[PDB]
Design a protein around this motif. Structure first.
Motif, mmCIF file in Angstrom:
data_model
loop_
_atom_site.group_PDB
_atom_site.id
_atom_site.type_symbol
_atom_site.label_atom_id
_atom_site.label_comp_id
_atom_site.label_asym_id
_atom_site.label_seq_id
_atom_site.Cartn_x
_atom_site.Cartn_y
_atom_site.Cartn_z
ATOM 1 N N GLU A 89 -13.389 -15.219 0.402
ATOM 2 C CA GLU A 89 -13.918 -14.808 -0.892
ATOM 3 C C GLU A 89 -15.136 -13.910 -0.729
ATOM 4 O O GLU A 89 -15.271 -12.907 -1.442
ATOM 5 N N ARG A 145 -13.955 -10.447 0.476
ATOM 6 C CA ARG A 145 -13.299 -9.733 -0.614
ATOM 7 C C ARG A 145 -14.310 -9.193 -1.611
ATOM 8 O O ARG A 145 -14.206 -8.043 -2.048
ATOM 9 N N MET A 146 -15.293 -10.016 -1.986
ATOM 10 C CA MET A 146 -16.317 -9.588 -2.934
ATOM 11 C C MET A 146 -17.083 -8.382 -2.413
ATOM 12 O O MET A 146 -17.252 -7.389 -3.129
ATOM 13 N N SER A 179 -15.113 -14.706 -13.058
ATOM 14 C CA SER A 179 -14.773 -14.135 -11.770
ATOM 15 C C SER A 179 -15.906 -14.246 -10.763
ATOM 16 O O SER A 179 -15.672 -14.052 -9.567
ATOM 17 N N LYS A 224 0.794 -1.224 0.000
ATOM 18 C CA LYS A 224 0.000 0.000 0.000
ATOM 19 C C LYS A 224 0.830 1.278 0.000
ATOM 20 O O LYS A 224 0.450 2.243 -0.667
ATOM 21 N N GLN A 274 -16.330 -6.118 0.143
ATOM 22 C CA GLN A 274 -15.532 -4.910 0.325
ATOM 23 C C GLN A 274 -14.908 -4.412 -0.970
ATOM 24 O O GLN A 274 -14.434 -3.274 -1.006
ATOM 25 N N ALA A 275 -14.871 -5.228 -2.021
ATOM 26 C CA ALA A 275 -14.432 -4.740 -3.316
ATOM 27 C C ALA A 275 -15.575 -4.145 -4.111
ATOM 28 O O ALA A 275 -15.349 -3.294 -4.976
ATOM 29 N N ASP A 276 -16.801 -4.579 -3.837
ATOM 30 C CA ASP A 276 -17.949 -3.952 -4.471
ATOM 31 C C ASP A 276 -18.217 -2.570 -3.898
ATOM 32 O O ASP A 276 -18.658 -1.676 -4.628
ATOM 33 N N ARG A 277 -17.988 -2.393 -2.588
ATOM 34 C CA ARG A 277 -18.364 -1.153 -1.897
ATOM 35 C C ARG A 277 -17.774 0.099 -2.549
ATOM 36 O O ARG A 277 -18.429 1.144 -2.603
ATOM 37 N N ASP A 278 -16.546 0.016 -3.048
ATOM 38 C CA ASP A 278 -15.897 1.165 -3.677
ATOM 39 C C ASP A 278 -15.949 1.038 -5.201
ATOM 40 O O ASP A 278 -14.945 0.873 -5.894
ATOM 41 N N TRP A 279 -17.167 1.158 -5.732
ATOM 42 C CA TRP A 279 -17.364 0.973 -7.168
ATOM 43 C C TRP A 279 -16.811 2.143 -7.968
ATOM 44 O O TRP A 279 -16.042 1.945 -8.916
#
Lengths: 438, 101
Positions: free
Chosen positions: A325, A328-329, A352, A179, A331-336
């Protein structure tokens, strides 16, 4: 609860504030047994439900509680239950909102440096590692010497302690390295050393299956397997800059090497190898499709094996894959909005998305059969895997209703409680299903 | 609301706030219903609403008249001529929804 704890508490009558800290630490340290989901839900609700300015009544009490807990931890200086509980409360308060502990991380740094050989101390190290993982990237303009000593002591910790601490610290190391800083040559040399050591062990074993040096240096091999697994999971060095030259397909290498060490004569070696494979899997899911991995799992879970730690390890691999999984799905969707403008309209990907379903269809049947085991831990883990599957709808529900019913007559109460609750949720949506399998 | 037809509005929409003092003599039927028919820019929809309103008003007037007449007639007939465990749900499964994990 917004009126019982989270009130501004003006800077007088400090005894009440100290008593409040005592109370909250008691609550969380007692709630450690069951789960922390409810606490997080409550705090989420209290924070979100007042989004306007409106004097920010909860924000003030929250920030004053976290900084006063920081000060209490400092002034402790030297009953350990309160230390571990306070650090746990800090961890939760970081998780719900990360900005609250940006300023105090420099005060949290010393505990990570050095410690003792007692349990509660290890729990402290694990929790402060988690906090650092959550907060370090958000820090406004950090100091480079601070990052240097952080990475240094993290490595010093990796090469000197047990399993759980290694896991929970290589997590934060990978996060901070990917990061903010970029000195990945260090981690590359670390993996070089581990890979070379375990490969030399493999080569020496390939023609000497009866030598004795392995029965002497066993700990180095075990630690190396677990470490290369964790490294491959959390921090993918099969990319452009880690190697620094043409790729030699290192993921395939580690796959073949671990898969080799699966077939062996002791037990601890096999358990550690399966752990390595599981960590490798959570980073490259497609590897599950390979024939050797398939036959490996479908032989371990069946065939009336003597071992009961291999089966537990397999089920734990599946369980951690599903949970990770899912998280990850979400918290990766939240910041579209940061990536939206750079994704197609005509594609609508599935490989995917559908992948997480497909995996289960290769193993599911066997897992269900594992309900009929005489041990209790195996049954508990099997029920955890099925109750993680169904709760995302991955698989068709009415083919694993009968097993989920026969699990309604175990002695242990938590078991059949979870089972029967799962059953009433299966029924409340779909009217007919239970009448089909009765 | 507001108007010399607010009473009929209320009787056609809400009908509960309309008190026994309103219903009786607030509206002169033969005048108000006569007013409704040539009133400027009256939509058919609102007219139907007002129809149900005025019919409800009239029905209530009928109810009150019957009640008062019955009271009077009951009066006039008077004169003065001096001449353990019993039912518990079986165990707790009825109401003890178990805690999730």
């Amino acid at each position: 609860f917004q009126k019982l704890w989270f009130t501004p508490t003006p800077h007088n009558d400090k005894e009440a504030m100290t008593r409040k800290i005592l109370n909250i630490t008691d609550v969380v340290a007692a709630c450690r047994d069951t789960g922390y989901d409810w606490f997080e839900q409550l705090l989420q609700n209290l924070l979100k439900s007042e989004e306007d300015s409106s004097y920010k009544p909860v924000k003030k009490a929250c920030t004053q509680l976290v900084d006063n807990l920081v000060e209490h931890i400092l002034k402790y200086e030297e009953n350990s239950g309160r230390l571990v509980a306070c650090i746990t409360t800090l961890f939760l308060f970081s998780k719900i909102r990360p900005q609250l502990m940006v300023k105090h991380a420099m005060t949290m740094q010393p505990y990570l440096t050095t410690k003792c050989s007692t349990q509660n101390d290890f729990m402290v190290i694990c929790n402060v590692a988690k906090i650092l993982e959550l907060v370090v990237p958000l820090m406004e303009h950090p100091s480079e010497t601070f990052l240097a000593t952080i990475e240094e002591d993290l490595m010093k910790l990796i090469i000197k302690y047990g399993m759980t601490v290694v896991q929970h610290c290589v997590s934060c190391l990978g996060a901070v390295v990917n990061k903010v800083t970029q000195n990945f040559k260090f981690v590359w040399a670390c993996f070089n050393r581990y890979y070379g050591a375990i490969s030399k062990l493999k080569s020496q074993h390939q023609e000497d299956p009866n030598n004795t040096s392995l029965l002497t240096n066993k700990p180095a091999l075990l630690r190396s397997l677990f470490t290369v697994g964790a490294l491959c999971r959390h921090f993918d060095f099969d990319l452009e800059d880690f190697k620094g030259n043409s790729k030699v397909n290192i993921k395939d290498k580690v796959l073949e090497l671990l898969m080799y060490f699966t077939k062996h004569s002791d037990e601890e070696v096999q358990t550690k190898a399966i752990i390595g494979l599981g960590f490798a899997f959570i980073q490259h899911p497609s590897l599950m499709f390979e024939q050797e991995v398939k036959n490996l799992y479908n032989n371990i879970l069946s065939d009336k094996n003597s071992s009961v730690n291999l089966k537990i390890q397999v089920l734990k691999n599946l369980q951690t894959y599903l949970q990770e999984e899912d998280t990850r799905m979400q918290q990766a969707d939240r910041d579209w909005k940061k990536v939206a403008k750079q994704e197609d309209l005509k594609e609508m990907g599935d490989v995917s998305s559908g992948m997480s379903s497909s995996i289960m269809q290769l193993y599911l049947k066997q897992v269900l059969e594992a309900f009929f085991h005489t041990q209790s831990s195996v049954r508990h883990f099997a029920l955890n895997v099925i109750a993680l599957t169904l709760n995302q709808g991955l698989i068709h529900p009415v083919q694993c209703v009968p097993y989920l019913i026969a699990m309604g007559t175990d002695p242990e109460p938590a078991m059949r409680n979870k089972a029967d609750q799962q059953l009433v949720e299966i029924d409340k949506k779909y009217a007919g299903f239970i009448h089909m399998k009765a | 609301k507001r108007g010399p037809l607010a009473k009929i509005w209320l009787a056609a929409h809400w009908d509960k706030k309309l008190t026994k003092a309103h219903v009786f003599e607030c509206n002169l039927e033969s005048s108000v219903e006569s007013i409704i028919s040539p009133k400027v820019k009256m939509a058919l929809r609102t007219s139907g609403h007002l129809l149900l309103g005025v019919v409800r008003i009239y029905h209530r007037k009928a109810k009150y008249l019957l009640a008062d007449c019955n009271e009077a007639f009951i009066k006039i007939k008077m004169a003065f001529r001096p001449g353990i465990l019993q039912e518990n749900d079986f165990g707790d499964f009825g109401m003890d929804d178990r805690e999730i994990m």
